[PDB]
Amino acid sequence: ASGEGPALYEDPPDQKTSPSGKPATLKICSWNVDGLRAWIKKKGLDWVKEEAPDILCLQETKCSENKLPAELQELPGLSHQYWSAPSEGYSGVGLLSRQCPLKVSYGIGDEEHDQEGRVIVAEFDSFVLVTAYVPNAGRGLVRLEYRQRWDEAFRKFLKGLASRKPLVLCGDLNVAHEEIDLRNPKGNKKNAGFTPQERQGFGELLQAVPLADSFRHLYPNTPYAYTFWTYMMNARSKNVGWRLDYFLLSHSLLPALCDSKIRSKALGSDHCPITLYLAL
Ligand SMILES: O=C(O)c1cc2cc([N+](=O)[O-])ccc2[nH]1
């Protein structure tokens, strides 16, 4: 018999100025859409239009780069579009920007980890943005050994990128770092997204690059702030969720951090969007 009832979470108002008072100049939105076509049918684009981000990162598009829905043409102000998908119907990431990036790359430079369309790297003047859909550990943890290999290769790759330019990593990292990051830590310690191996990998990623978890850095003691809820058992209406989607930043970008938002009420997927405001 289920132990959780509703838990309130009200994302605070958008702080659009840096701690020094500098207005935000860049708004990035990241969203695991759980199928680009399904998300469009569920009015996901109408939400993007209201949010009006400068850069939109999408994960789990499940769409081949050569089968993109024609409705994507109804997104003005995000004309530079980049997509990665497996060598259709699984994984897939997208990055849509108002301004053209200096360079766009796909993957993490390792053949073993570059066949499932999980990563886009876009270099800009002041920083390099990476969007990722991290491999899920799987039912029965059958992909956990592979996920640990992925974590090490990704950490090495990001540390290399950060040594040249400040980094922003966003996306569905498929781990709730700490107990405060999910509604049911006790029942999920042996499930994908909350194994000690995955949590330890997330801690290693923050320490080694290094990177700061933008949301937790700003709201260190705030509970019930999630970005994913299973479609089953009315989990979203009870706020039985997990915070799997993040914006991780280089320490040098902390003075530029205005806010890191969780758009809780935005429908269209089993994940909600997250939004970052930077004063670059
Ligand atoms: O590196 C930077 O300082 C920077 C890149 C960038 C891109 C957009 N955009 O609209 O795609 C807006 C503001 C931006 N700032």
Numbering used by the authors: 37 to 123, 126 to 318
Provide excerpts from the study.
Mammalian AP endonuclease 1 (APE1) initiates repair of abasic (apurinic/apyrimidinic) sites and other toxic and mutagenic DNA lesions and performs critical roles in base excision repair (BER) and single strand break repair (SSBR). APE1 hydrolytically cleaves phosphodiester bonds at abasic sites, which arise through spontaneous rupture of the N-glycosyl bond (depurination) or by the activity of DNA glycosylases, which initiate BER. APE1 is the major mammalian enzyme for repair of abasic sites, which impair DNA replication and other processes, causing DNA strand breaks and cross links. In addition to its AP endonuclease activity, the exonuclease activity of APE1 processes BER intermediates generated by bifunctional DNA glycosylases and removes 3´-blocking groups arising at strand breaks.
We also sought to obtain a crystal structure of APE1 in complex with one of the indole compounds and found success with 5-nitroindole-2-carboxylic acid. The crystals used to determine the structure of APE1 in complex with 3 were generated by soaking preformed crystals of apo APE1 in a solution of mother liquor with 5% DMSO and 100 mM compound 3. While this concentration of 3 is two orders of magnitude above that observed to form aggregates, our result indicates that some fraction of the compound, perhaps a small fraction, is populated in the monomeric form under the crystallization conditions. Additional evidence for binding of compound 3 to this remote pocket is provided by the Fo-Fc map calculated using a model that does not include the compound The 5-nitro of 3 accepts hydrogen bonds from S135 and R136 and the backbone N of Q137, and the 2-carboxyl of 3 is contacted by the hydroxyl and the backbone N of S164. The pocket features many hydrophobic residues, including L62, I64, I91, F162, and F165. Regarding APE1 conformational changes caused by the binding of compound 3, superposition of our two new structures for apo APE1, free and in complex with compound 3, reveals that binding of 3 induces minor changes in overall structure with some significant changes in the remote binding site for residues including L62, D90, R136, Q137, F162, S164, F165, and L318. Remarkably, our results also show that the indole compounds bind at a pocket of APE1 that is distal from its active site, with specific interactions defined in a crystal structure of APE1 in complex with compound 3. However, the activity assays show that these compounds inhibit APE1 only under conditions that permit compound aggregation and not under conditions that disrupt it (with detergent).
